[PDB]
Amino acid sequence: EVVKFMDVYQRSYCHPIETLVDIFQEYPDEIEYIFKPSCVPLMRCGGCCNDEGLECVPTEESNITMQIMRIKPHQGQHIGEMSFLQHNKCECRPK
């Protein structure tokens, strides 16, 4: 039940991994709506690189469309489609 070294290493290295992303972080200029859910599941680059001086960043990206409940406090709410970027491929690169 010990995780073998080469298994830890391969599962942790820089690669797209399902990440729970705050919508407001992805749309930092929204001042009219709040969202339910407030976060979405997005494939995003994550993990570590050989060189500590490098960061796991996206090279290839694509969109995905999700129905989000867009809420205007004391006014209303509606289900609407919003798009989010996904990372399809990642690389280790200078921060």
Next chain:
Amino acid sequence: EVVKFMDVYQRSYCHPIETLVDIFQEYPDEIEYIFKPSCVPLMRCGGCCNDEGLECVPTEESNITMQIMRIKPHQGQHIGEMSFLQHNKCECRPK
């Protein structure tokens, strides 16, 4: 292709999700050493809650043992076992 509202709601809500976690964060006084890999895959509470006030936190925990390469830079390196905390269950409670 459009992710339907109840799918994104259920998939993003507070639950243990695999999270790539910096060892240096988990072992902050392992100062003299670096590790390979530098991050590990761990189940951790992630995602959002119904109210902004509520936070996603663990209620059941457990340990996992991994083979990690302990390195003393420009000196030596050894593959040993390290224990890491995982989250088995999460719940939304007041901050």
